[PDB]
Design a protein around this ligand. Structure first.
Ligand SMILES: CCOc1ccc(C(=O)Nc2ccc(F)c([C@@]3(C)N=C(N)OCC3(F)F)c2)nc1
Ligand SMILES: CCOc1ccc(C(=O)Nc2ccc(F)c([C@@]3(C)N=C(N)OCC3(F)F)c2)nc1
Lengths: 370, 112, 367, 112
């Protein structure tokens, strides 16, 4: 449990991943933590941009279900044999649990170059598992077989590794209070966004623009992804508050010298969320360090920077641009997502996010979700 | 869509013996992992035993090892738990579970 | 085959030479600059360097009793001027007495993430500060070691290097060396006749290239172009295929967006020693559309490796890393040759060919 | 504007002695590293000796060591070369040098 502290490697750019031991004798793989899907899938054959894969023929305990699954996504896909084997987690657990696994033998645009993970642990709900919700997820297997609570928490520590805590909340990963918001639906970790504000001022938008058709906490998405219309109204407000075009679309990076200190000039971005006691809301904030994102890291007198927010067609995705700011509690048992100020989320001593509350839920619907 | 109904529970004396069944309908049982968990009155949810889809891989809780045997008959959509050498501490509701879903339970009660 | 790979560094943070100064010897790392003429090293600690030359620990150091300040656009350095024995470990048995300036006060000189803590000006006397009578390092070395008055350098930074002091090393090039005359002994000033973009000439009088000088400078990262020339070059380049041009922004492209294959060659024509003839040096997109992150992803972000200047066409790193370049002060000329270590994946990133007639151009392109 | 003029060259027998002088005008001589180089007919220049600005650091080509003494008299803007135990192979033109610039030279001849 406190053994789970610092169990993830990686960053907010290339993803955070967990070591996992699979089969008998154990094969050691690097599995991305992804709260936006629900399958457990690993490389099953050598690939160009991976070092190692799970060989099912060297596992004495592997058994095949005799069918295979394909998962499609916007750019790319992955097909895999569905089977079952024993897994252990070196950081957290003394024993082993019998889980479903998809061994990928064919994919398009799945394993990309300079990526250190060779598989993916979907930690969302049964409903988004392929090929059907009746394929037990890893987290429902572990919860059941290890007698832990139906809660996990995650802390990302690469703004400017991480801890993934399976079966509770570890106090030394946060400071202050945990504020919780309701899970609105159990497929993605869907929550209700009430209000966005840039630099102390609100965007002229209905609260339902934000949750179109869903605001989700996704560890398997790099950026804060906003529906096109929200995206456009955020950009217009950020530009107005300071310095800046292709920079907004992710097709160019703006370079500034050290002393032109870029961060001083952009505004805070605050996301208002409904408290469990509905008359109230709280506010999670990120500052410029998380969303104006240094890309070179060479420690020269300049840096070039990506805008870590991007348009989505129909999804508001609270990915790593925001999650890096907080400790995040996926409390499935109580149907709620917690957020707390994260100690590791400060660049040169300064905190790069904030959390605050409570505020009143007047001036916004009883309910902001379709 | 996981529907399940356990039965076979009842009242037995220590050293007694029961066979619990769990019947499934509506999902692909012969391709699912299946597990038994029990739950005493105001004690914790306690995992009992898990069986892989074809039956060859079974794992067990220390507390029931050598006493209980999990097994399934895929052709009849049914899971089993052979419960021997029953002692009062085994008293509880036994639930079969798969993919986040469970049956109503079967009451197993061991007393002298 | 002695001074072959004696340089470290890269086409962005500079190529530097290892040098031992004073008695007992102190080891410094000194940037090779063919566009200035002082030998200057850090003399005190400074927050962005690991070491410096402490003149008080050298029993052979003598002070001249005066200092110097040198200004450039964005900064300056001030140093005490003295004299001490130096050796270049990869290249030389003995030590030679040279002038050294020890920097105790600078601005914007040592910068974060630099690996060198001194500068070696290999240009001519005329540019030495505080006057041309401050014997330059290469004039000392030439005189005291009995070598020919020639050096040559190969940068392998594209995608270390060699500085050969006193000649030319066959293994550092392939094909023929072409020589263009040195027009004036100050900078290494050479006579550009024609710029071609993706095989089309710019509409420019040849004097535009040599206002007010065209020079070869291992001390400048970018190919730097007078504004008028740089306006033609951007327009021509962007035709053949805005923050990017100014170096304000980087352009990111995925690797199947294959961005190098959609930009033109840039050719620079220089006069042969035979004045009725010229040869051309050419760079490809690889050299002037530069990958900035080297992070090994499925996309790269790039800066344009050309920049405007006010008073000079500076043939900096980004052309030099294409070729082996011979600075043959003896016969007043600069040699260029294809450089084998200029290949990405095994792909050439540069070209040399000739001769072509100079009928088409004036007989002197320098105003 | 480095301006230099050598003298004291002449014809001597093997075993003999000469003192060369080099007079400087129009540059900062009392601040200059100063060098002597020599050239016999159609052979390359041969470095002889270098002296630093105050006279305390002097260096010598192996070929002249213990036989020639370089020195300077700053207040007179003059470089010297004391040359003892001359031999036929010291026959050459001698030139004083600084910062790229040399004087016309002085002819030394050592013959039977
Ligand atoms: C810290 C965030 O940084 C990251 C960097 C890369 C990645 C990454 O590769 N994610 C990733 C790769 C393939 C993939 F298929 C997925 C899926 C299943 N998960 C999510 N949520 O959205 C896209 C997706 F449905 F396809 C994610 N993730 C996070
Ligand atoms: C190979 C290119 O990479 C490089 C990176 C940095 C540098 C570099 O710093 N050059 C550099 C730094 C300070 C400085 F003062 C100088 C001087 C004297 N020399 C030249 N020619 O131009 C500017 C200058 F007159 F000021 C050069 N050079 C090359």
């Amino acid at each position: 449990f406190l053994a789970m502290v610092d169990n993830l490697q990686g960053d907010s750019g290339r993803g955070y991943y967990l070591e996992m031991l699979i089969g008998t004798p154990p094969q050691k793989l690097q599995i991305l933590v992804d709260t936006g899907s629900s399958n457990f899938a690993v490389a099953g054959t050598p690939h160009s941009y991976i070092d190692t894969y799970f060989d099912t023929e060297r596992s004495s305990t592997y058994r095949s279900k005799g069918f295979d699954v394909t998962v499609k996504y916007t750019q790319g896909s992955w097909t895999g044999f569905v089977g079952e084997d024993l897994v252990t987690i070196p950081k957290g657990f003394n024993t082993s649990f019998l889980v479903n696994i998809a061994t990928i033998f064919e994919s398009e645009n799945f394993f990309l170059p300079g990526i250190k993970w060779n598989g993916i642990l979907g930690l969302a709900y049964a409903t988004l598992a392929k090929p059907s919700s009746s394929l037990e997820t890893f987290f429902d297997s572990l919860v059941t077989q290890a007698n832990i609570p139906n809660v996990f928490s995650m802390q990302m520590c690469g703004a400017g590794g991480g801890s993934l805590v399976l079966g509770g909340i570890e106090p030394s990963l946060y400071k202050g209070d945990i504020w919780y918001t309701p899970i609105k639906e159990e497929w993605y970790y869907q929550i209700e966004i009430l209000k966005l504000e840039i630099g102390g001022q609100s965007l002229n938008l209905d609260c339902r623009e934000y949750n179109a058709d869903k605001a989700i906490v996704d560890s398997g998405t790099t950026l804060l992804r906003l529906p096109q219309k929200v995206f456009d109204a955020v950009v217009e407000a950020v530009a107005r508050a300071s310095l800046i075009d292709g920079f907004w679309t992710g097709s160019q990076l703006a370079c500034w010298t050290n002393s032109e200190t870029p961060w001083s000039y952009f505004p805070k971005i605050s996301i208002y969320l409904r408290d469990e006691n509905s008359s109230r809301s709280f506010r999670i904030t990120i500052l410029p360090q998380l969303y104006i994102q240094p890309m070179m890291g060479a420690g020269l007198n300049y840096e070039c920077y990506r805008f870590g927010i991007s348009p989505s067609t129909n999804a508001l995705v609270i990915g790593a641009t925001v999650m890096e700011g907080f400790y995040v509690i996926f409390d499935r048992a109580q149907k709620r997502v917690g957020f707390a100020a994260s100690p590791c989320a400060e660049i040169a001593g300064a905190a790069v996010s904030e959390i605050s509350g409570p505020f009143s839920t007047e001036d916004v619907a009883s309910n902001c979700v379709p | 869509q996981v529907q399940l109904q356990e039965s076979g529970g009842g009242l037995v004396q220590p050293g007694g013996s029961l066979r619990l069944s769990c019947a499934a309908s509506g999902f692909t049982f012969s391709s699912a992992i299946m597990t038994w968990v029990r739950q005493a009155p105001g004690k914790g949810r306690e995992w009992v035993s898990t069986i892989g889809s074809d039956g060859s891989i079974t794992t067990y809780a220390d507390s029931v090892k050598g006493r209980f045997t999990i097994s399934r008959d895929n052709a009849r959509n049914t899971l089993y738990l052979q419960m021997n050498s029953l002692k009062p501490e085994d008293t509880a509701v036994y639930y079969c579970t798969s993919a986040g879903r469970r049956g109503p339970g079967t009451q197993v009660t061991v007393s002298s």
